[PDB]
């Protein structure tokens, strides 16, 4: 199973292994037991070129893991600016909800990743989205004491 | 003297530089201290462009210079420009510690003896911090530094605060990128005035992780953190709910389906039964019901180490919140300049 070797390769951050496995037919849409695909893993660790070649070869941009996380949630949560752009370009769902209703905007806001917030917003992110607690990005800027965040949010 | 294109000007006392890490607060090099004949760690900070950097830097300098305890990282020296206008940068010199509990845990499952001894050292350090009227607020394995002989020193007081009973009740945790897995459930709920008890929760999370070698509440966000926590502790009792002041926090917990408590021996079937009894007292949902640092040291799990006469307290506790939040970054520039004067 090349599927199983591609995930690790992707989680490792090796560009060449990824290519070789893909050239030999590795399933770009393989998943681990927790539903992470090679695209999730590359987007979480922050490997822009790997995120690109998987998308280029049919990776499901909007695959959900068992917590309802997409590659875009991961990128947003981990501060990976270029990766967010790449995902959006390839049709990532800017308003994807996890199990708790958090969107990529909630995650970037809570992490204080201002450039990502701006990119999400420019791509139609919903600033009024509420998670299952009731919080919007705005409430996050108040709760976290992020005055710079609350600056762009109005 | 230039390292990765940055000036790193550590005078004739510190030579033989090597870069060993960098980020949002601190380019770090190792260097040879030519006075003490040992290699040391030198954190270069330049924080004057942002009020948040200055608060954090002043606190940390103030707190580390007041503390002197074997289980707390000290500041051995400070280098800065001889006049306020010149100071673009501050260099803080500390002991060079070869590793940390985060790296250790990923290389091996600790024996019971090592666990006990590390938990002893963590609490002995914590005893002194709490006796100084300080809350660390960011205890986690990577803030537990280790040398090659199992000596542990809790460092990183950038998010520490004096416990002020009343008045400006703290007070957000504004280092938004790092783990939240060790944060007490009242911080996740955005509680009002939390206490020393938040640090005892973090220590209980570290204990649990030393017992099984994996984090006990690894939430992906605040709501997934709560779910992890409630999944093991069970639904809080009405008594514990009733203690929650924040209404929409209490209302949110009331909204959730009932979860039963998972017995600690089911999660940790090979752990020492006394470490589990102690763990139970640390990881109590209700902050008021959690064990305190002195009672934890005197718990039977730690009997082989517990020695009150060799567990020092602070000779000069901090009295009140340092009044920093409203103060502008030029003013904070002045006190940082003064705090650092004892070194030249």
Swiss-Prot record, chain B:
Domain called Protein kinase: residue spans: 14-302
Residues that coordinate or bind ATP: 20-28, 43
GO BP field: androgen receptor signaling pathway; animal organ morphogenesis; apoptotic process; B cell receptor signaling pathway; Bergmann glial cell differentiation; cardiac neural crest cell development involved in heart development; caveolin-mediated endocytosis; cell surface receptor signaling pathway
Positions of post-translational Phosphotyrosine modification: 176
Cofactor field: Mg(2+)
GO MF, one example: double-stranded DNA binding
InterPro entries in alphabetical order: Kinase-like_dom_sf, MAP_kinase, MAP_kinase_CS, MAPK_ERK1/2, Prot_kinase_dom, Protein_kinase_ATP_BS, Ser/Thr_kinase_AS
GO CC aspect terms: axon; caveola; centrosome; cytoplasm; cytoskeleton; cytosol; dendrite cytoplasm; early endosome
Residues recorded with modification Phosphothreonine: 174, 179
Signal peptide region: none
List of catalytic residues: 138 (proton acceptor)
UniProt comment concerning the protein's domains: The TXY motif contains the threonine and tyrosine residues whose phosphorylation activates the MAP kinases.
Family: Belongs to the protein kinase superfamily. CMGC Ser/Thr protein kinase family. MAP kinase subfamily.
Function as written in the Swiss-Prot or TrEMBL entry: Serine/threonine kinase which acts as an essential component of the MAP kinase signal transduction pathway. MAPK1/ERK2 and MAPK3/ERK1 are the 2 MAPKs which play an important role in the MAPK/ERK cascade. They participate also in a signaling cascade initiated by activated KIT and KITLG/SCF. Depending on the cellular context, the MAPK/ERK cascade mediates diverse biological functions such as cell growth, adhesion, survival and differentiation through the regulation of transcription, translation, cytoskeletal rearrangements. Acts as a transcriptional repressor. Binds to a [GC]AAA[GC] consensus sequence. Repress the expression of interferon gamma-induced genes. Seems to bind to the promoter of CCL5, DMP1, IFIH1, IFITM1, IRF7, IRF9, LAMP3, OAS1, OAS2, OAS3 and STAT1. Transcriptional activity is independent of kinase activity.
Protein name: Mitogen-activated protein kinase 1
Organism for this UniProt entry: Rattus norvegicus (Rat)
